[PDB]
């Protein structure tokens, strides 16, 4: 029903926006009140990211440690991280070149590392460190507003690793954050019940304010940029990696999971396609059952290459829409956020919209601009899963080839 309601809200939002903007003249103040129901939605989304990031990173990282207990385990995880990072890098390259939403470097790099190690954990929830060069030059820093997503992610990564390996002593902390992540995901579900009504007034608000329909062109280019990046990563990146590691032909292997890919276009939930994905791995291809039953279940929630490439493109698109040139340090900041979003937002379909707010909040971009992304998300939702299961495809073959001795 989430897809049905989101499309209805987008359709109803456009109808309301065009009719309101043509059958009534609203003041700048009256346009602000008309978007209040959607403004309330946006501050709900920002309200939940802090518990979502902390609970999901600690539970996800601690879960990964338990899941992997051998040389086979680490190779699968290493592969997953590599593909997800590559997907993000490919997306970032396209936007700067394609430039859909258009018309110091040393200090920014150090600011990145400084923000990964915040001087206060409580302030990292609502403040970020920013340096400036002044004067024959001195560097002076200040704590501007904006949640420090990098600092929270890094600490929760270190904490999750320490808590996982503490054994029975840290079990109370694992249980505490396991329940916290479960509770926070139920709150995210409650927010997604209000999302259709909030999105209705946010799409309508964007329609009313804009006097030129050229935003449709920009949004169309963004749709192409994500589609171009998703296509390249599926036929020009993922196969060669399979080629390089697995000397066999990649398109023979990729052609072998038409059933899983087709099922990924019907249910649009990689977890729901697991039964088909297993059958393809054992029946059409030759991958030992023991390797597949480890790699694929983990990849169903860790390996999300389609989503990672989509979020990275969208975040830079929003920056260009606002004409805020993305400093390179910010460009990297989107890379770790998107990669860590695989467990940083619990890797749950409900948290698909929440991640963009996290990515936008990391780089201090208007979160309200995510409405244009949500307008066409449902068009790209089916295909993002296609790459996600596709990445889980080449992992089974790659990991088995590398870890053949262990099997």
Ligand X SMILES: COCC(CCO[C@H]1CC[C@@]2(C)C(=CC[C@H]3[C@@H]4C[C@@H]5O[C@]6(CC[C@@H](C)CO6)[C@@H](C)[C@@H]5[C@@]4(C)CC[C@@H]32)C1)COC
Q: Which residues are annotated as a binding site?
A: 80, 83-84, 268, 270, 299, 301, 303, 305, 307, 342-343, 345, 348, 384-385, 388, 392
Spatial separation of the C-alpha atoms in residues 93 and 229, rounded to whole Å = 9
Q: Which residues contact 246 (CB under 8 A, 6 or more apart)?
A: 253, 394, 397, 398, 401
Minimum CB separation from ligand CLR for residue 65, in Å? 9
Binding-site size, ligand CLR (CB under 6 A): 6
In the bound complex, which residue of the shown chain has the CB atom lying closest to ligand X?
A: 335
Q: Write the interaction track for ligand CLR spanning residues 113-152; mark x where CB under 6 A is met and - where it is not.
A: ---x------------------------------------
* Binders of ligand X in range 84-143 (CB under 6 A): 85, 89, 92-93, 96
Annotated binding site for L-aspartate, which residues? 268, 270, 307, 348, 384-385, 388
Tokens read off for 207: 């329609």
* Binders of ligand CLR in range 78-117 (CB under 6 A): 116
Burial class (CB in 10 A: 0-12, 13-18, 19+), 145: exposed
Residue of 55, 70, 72, 301 lying closest to 160 (CA atoms) = 55
The residue within the footprint of ligand X, chosen from 108, 191, 332, 402 (CB under 6 A), is: 332
Tell me, what DSSP letter sits at residue 104? Answer: -
Task: Considering only the stretches 222-230, 251-259, 279-287, 296-304, report the one whose residues sit in contact with Na ion under the rule CB under 5 A.
Answer: 296-304
Spatial separation of the C-alpha atoms in residues 286 and 284, rounded to whole Å = 7
Q: Say how many C-beta atoms besides its own lie within 10 A of residue 11's C-beta.
A: 13
The residue within the footprint of ligand CLR, chosen from 93, 108, 161, 332 (CB under 6 A), is: 161
Q: Which does 161 bind (CB under 5 to 8 A by kind): ligand X, Na ion, ligand CLR, none?
A: ligand CLR
15 touches ligand X (CB under 6 A):
no
Q: Which does 112 bind (CB under 5 to 8 A by kind): Na ion, ligand CLR, ligand X, none?
A: none
Please, what is the Cα angle at 102 between 101 and 105, to 5 degrees? Answer: 100
Q: Write the interaction track for ligand X spanning residues 336-365; mark x where CB under 6 A is met and - where it is not.
A: x-----------------------------
- Characterize 349-363 residue by residue with b for buried, 16 or more Cβ atoms within 10 angstroms of its Cβ, and e for exposed: bbbbbbbbbbbbbbb
Q: Which does 165 bind (CB under 5 to 8 A by kind): ligand X, Na ion, ligand CLR, none?
A: ligand CLR
- Cβ proximity to ligand CLR, 150 vs 389, nearer residue: 150
Task: Considering only the stretches 175-183, 198-206, 327-335, 344-352, report the one whose residues sit in contact with ligand X under the rule CB under 6 A.
Answer: 327-335
83 touches Na ion (CB under 5 A):
yes
Element (H, E) at 194: helix 171-209
Let me know: does 358 contact 345? Beta carbons within 8 Å: yes
Tell me, what DSSP letter sits at residue 248? Answer: S
Task: Considering only the stretches 136-144, 158-166, 193-201, 299-307, report the one whose residues sit in contact with ligand CLR under the rule CB under 6 A.
Answer: 158-166
Task: Considering only the stretches 93-101, 155-163, 225-233, 246-254, report the one whose residues sit in contact with ligand CLR under the rule CB under 6 A.
Answer: 155-163
Minimum CB separation from ligand CLR for residue 258, in Å? 40
In the bound complex, which residue of the shown chain has the CB atom lying closest to Na ion?
A: 84
Residue of 334, 342, 280, 312 lying closest to 82 (CA atoms) = 342
Spatial separation of the C-alpha atoms in residues 266 and 173, rounded to whole Å = 39
Q: Which does 16 bind (CB under 5 to 8 A by kind): Na ion, ligand CLR, ligand X, none?
A: none
Q: With left for phi above 0 and alpha for psi between -120 and 50, is residue 9 left, alpha or beta?
A: alpha
- Cβ proximity to Na ion, 199 vs 336, nearer residue: 336
- Cβ proximity to ligand CLR, 162 vs 232, nearer residue: 162
Helical ranges in 233-288 per DSSP H = 238-245, 250-255, 258-266, 274-279
- Cβ proximity to Na ion, 305 vs 368, nearer residue: 305
Spatial separation of the C-alpha atoms in residues 190 and 280, rounded to whole Å = 36
Q: How many CA atoms lie within 13 A of 22 on its CB side?
A: 7
Residues engaged in binding ligand CLR (CB under 6 A):
116, 154, 158, 161-162, 165
């Amino acid at each position: 029903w989430v897809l049905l309601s989101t499309v209805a809200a987008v359709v109803l939002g456009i109808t309301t926006g065009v009719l309101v903007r043509e059958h009534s003249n609203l003041s700048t103040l009256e346009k602000f009140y008309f978007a209040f129901p959607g403004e309330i939605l946006m501050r709900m989304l920002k309200l939940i990211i802090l518990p979502l990031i902390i609970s999901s990173m600690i539970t996800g990282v601690a879960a990964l440690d338990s899941n992997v207990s051998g040389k086979i385990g680490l190779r699968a995880v290493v592969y997953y991280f590599c593909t997800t990072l590559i997907a993000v890098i490919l997306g970032i390259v396209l936007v700067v070149s394609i430039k859909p939403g258009v018309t110091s470097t040393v200090d920014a790099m150090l600011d990145l590392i400084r923000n990964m190690f915040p001087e206060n954990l409580v302030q990292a929830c609502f403040q970020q460190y920013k340096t400036k060069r002044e004067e024959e030059y001195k560097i002076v820093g200040m704590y501007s507003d904006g949640i420090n997503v990098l600092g929270l992610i890094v600490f929760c990564l270190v904490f999750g690793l320490v808590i996982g390996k503490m054994g029975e002593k840290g079990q109370i902390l694992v249980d505490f954050f396991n329940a916290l992540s479960d509770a926070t995901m139920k709150i995210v579900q409650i927010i997604m019940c209000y999302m259709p009504l909030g999105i209705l007034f946010l799409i309508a608000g964007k329609i009313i304010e804009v006097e030129d329909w050229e935003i449709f062109r920009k949004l169309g280019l963004y749709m192409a940029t994500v589609l171009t990046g998703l296509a390249i990563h599926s036929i020009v990146i993922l196969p060669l990696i399979y080629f390089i590691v697995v000397r066999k032909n990649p398109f023979r292997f990729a052609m072998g999971m038409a059933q899983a890919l087709l099922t990924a276009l019907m249910i649009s939930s990689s977890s729901a396609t697991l039964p088909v994905t297993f059958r393809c791995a054992e029946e059409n291809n030759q991958v030992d059952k023991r390797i597949t039953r480890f790699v694929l279940p983990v990849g169903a929630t860790i390996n999300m290459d389609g989503t990672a490439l989509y979020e990275a493109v969208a975040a830079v698109f929003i920056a260009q829409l606002n004409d805020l040139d993305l400093g390179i340090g910010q460009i990297i900041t989107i890379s770790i956020t998107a990669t860590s979003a695989s467990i940083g937002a619990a890797g749950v379909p409900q948290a698909g919209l929440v991640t963009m707010v996290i990515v936008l909040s990391a780089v201090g971009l208007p979160a309200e601009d995510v409405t244009l992304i949500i307008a066409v998300d449902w068009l790209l939702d089916r295909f993002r899963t296609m790459v996600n299961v596709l990445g889980d495809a080449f992992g089974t073959g790659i990991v088995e080839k590398l870890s053949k001795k262990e099997l």
